[PDB]
Amino acid sequence: SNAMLSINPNEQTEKDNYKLLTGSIIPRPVAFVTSVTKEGVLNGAPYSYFNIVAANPPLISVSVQRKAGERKDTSRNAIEKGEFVVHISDESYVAAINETAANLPPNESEIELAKLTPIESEVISVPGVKEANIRMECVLERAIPLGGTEDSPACDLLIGRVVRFHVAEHLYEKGRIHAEGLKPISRLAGHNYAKLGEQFEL
């Protein structure tokens, strides 16, 4: 009736802690993020460690993991350009988003691999993809290295300031977004995802 387990993160592995965090903190919204390399290549990848930071000005966060203490393409590109695009992930293109999640060699475009379509941004110099129903042009407010060791951070928490919103007209009503028309997708544990659940009001 209330059997509770105590679990000490110091007494289990990183993978064990990962499984507990990703299974407990659910559902998670998924940012599909595009960024550009110094060589001009358009990268894209999904990140479920995504949320709002503030509305004044509009600030969002995406935590991008490092590989053995080194920044991933998305973080490197965001810091180098100071710009990136955050797209809302939805049922209409989640198949293509999933295709991007695989590991290409650096400086290969997951966007082109996944048959997605670049669309130039208005304020920033990093394109997004046309397939998204909502996307946000961002400038990088700060990148915060976190976790891991003094010398080898586990991740970089990217704080992005939205400088342009692009919203499908059919989703927009009096400043609000039709959640059931959007059909956002979310991430659970493992390779499980979730569609938007039944709504309720309090």
**Residues near Cl ion, by CB under 5 A:** 41-42, 65, 109, 120-121, 125, 127
Long-range contacts of 107-115 (CB under 8 A, 24+ apart): 107/37, 107/39, 107/41, 108/41, 109/41, 109/42, 109/43, 109/44, 110/43, 110/44, 110/45, 111/34, 111/42, 111/43, 111/44, 112/42, 114/44
In whole angstroms, how close is the CB of 132 to Cl ion at the nearest point?
A: 14
145-164 footprint of a second copy as x/- string (CB under 8 A): -xxx-----xx-x-x--xxx
Residues 24 to 53 in contact with a second copy, rule: CB under 8 A: 24-29, 48-53
Contact between 66 and 153 under an 8 Å Cβ cutoff? The reply is: yes
Q: Which partner from the list Cl ion, a second copy, none does 28 bind, CB cut-off 5 to 8 Å by kind?
A: a second copy
- Which residue stretch of 32-40, 76-84, 106-114, 129-137 sits at the interface with a second copy (rule: CB under 8 A)? 129-137
Determine if 188 is a binding residue for a second copy (CB under 8 A).
yes
**How many chain residues touch a second copy (CB under 8 A)?**
93
As measured in angstroms, the least distance from the Cβ of 39 to a second copy is 29
- Buried residues in 162-181 as b, exposed as e (16+ CB within 10 A): bbeebebeebeeeeeeeeee
**Residue 42 partner contact from a second copy, Cl ion, none using kind-dependent CB cut-offs of 5 to 8 Å:** Cl ion
